[PDB]
Amino acid sequence: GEFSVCDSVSVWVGDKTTATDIKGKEVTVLAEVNINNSVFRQYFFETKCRASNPVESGCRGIDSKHWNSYCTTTHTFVKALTTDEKQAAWRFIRIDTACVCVLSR
Amino acid sequence: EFSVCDSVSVWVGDKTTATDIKGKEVTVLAEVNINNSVFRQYFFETKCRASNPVESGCRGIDSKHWNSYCTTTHTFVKALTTDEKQAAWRFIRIDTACVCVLSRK
Ligand SMILES: CCCCCCCCCCCCC(=O)OC[C@@H](O)COP(=O)(O)O[C@@H]1[C@H](O)[C@H](O)[C@@H](O)[C@H](O)[C@H]1O
């Protein structure tokens, strides 16, 4: 009978094209690799905020009196086959992974 | 500005155990040696620094109405693994954020 402080929405992404790698550069993701008609697809599991303000006080369950709060997406790093158009390689790329509550006194 | 739960982030290069996307417990092959080329699987994980940042539970929570604690959440990354039978690439869950969980008092 639990509530999250922030409302998430997850999807699978099988068609990712563009991304930022762990070094802050913009890279292209190779969705599929076709080897002798055997196809390897890259899928990513992303979680994103629904609203930045679920409740109107910002986050849910916050002591609205002392703090203001909002909901916001944070990322993690996932390895992925990529190019920078100079080179094809596996690069840790940045991935939306959760919705978290940020405080402001 | 300030987070409701505190995070800690680690690069894990020696993973052995994991749970795949089907709930099966699988072994991770952290290190593969081919000819004289070693392949070490690297993962970026984020865990809770504490389940109770403040005594109440999560920081900032309306402690009157609300019970709360901090806990990890996960994405799914492809990892080279084994169960009893076969070696393969399986989606396994890895910790990626620390979020606050509510419960009505
Ligand atoms: C629906 C059915 C789907 C079936 C799923 C099948 C998918 C099979 C995919 C197999 C691809 C394996 C691969 O081809 O992956 C190699 C590639 O990931 C390794 O490259 P890299 O990460 O750069 O290697 C590290 C190095 O291990 C480490 O020691 C170093 O410290 C790092 O600096 C760095 O060099």
Can you spell out the DSSP letters for A32-73?
EEEETTEEEEP-EEEEEES-S-SBTTBSTTB-TTT-EEEEEE
Are residues A37 and A76 in contact, defined by beta-carbon separation less than 8 angstroms? no
Q: Which residue in B has a C-alpha nearest to residue A102's C-alpha?
A: B3
DSSP string, chain B: -EESS-EEEEEES---EEEBTTS-EEEE--EEEETTEEEE--EEEEEES-S-SBTTBSTTB-TTTEEEEEEEEEEEEEEEEE-SS-EEEEEEEEEEEEEEEEEE-
Which residues of chain A are within 8 Å of residue B97 when distances are taken between CB atoms?
74, 76, 97-98, 100
Q: How far apart are CA B61 and CA B73, in angstroms?
A: 19
Instruction: For residue B97, give Cα distances in angstroms to A1, A91, A99, B57.
Output: 21, 21, 9, 17
Judge whether B102 is closer than 8 Å to chain A, CB to CB. yes
> Strand A68-83 vs strand A88-104: parallel, antiparallel, or unpaired?
antiparallel
Experimental technique = X-ray
Q: What CATH number is attached to the domain comprising A98?
A: 2.10.90.10
Q: How far apart are CA B8 and CA B98, in angstroms?
A: 9
Q: How far is the CA of A42 from the centre of ligand 1 (A)?
A: 12
Joined tokens for residue B42? 């690297």
Residue B64 belongs to domain spanning: 1-105
- The total of structural domains in chain B comes to 1
- Composition of chain A by helix, strand, coil, percent to 5: 0, 65, 35
Judge whether B2 is closer than 8 Å to chain A, CB to CB. yes
CA angle B12, B14, B18 (to 5 degrees): 85
Residue nearest ligand 1's atom 17 by CA:
A90
Q: Which residue in A has a C-alpha nearest to residue B58's C-alpha?
A: A62
Inter-chain touch B97–A98, beta carbons under 8 Å = yes
DSSP 8-state secondary structure symbol assigned to residue A6: S
Of B3, B76, B102, the CB nearest to A61: B102
Give helix then strand counts, H and E, for chain A. 0, 9
> What is the distance in angstroms between the Cα of A88 and the nearest Cα belonging to chain B?
17
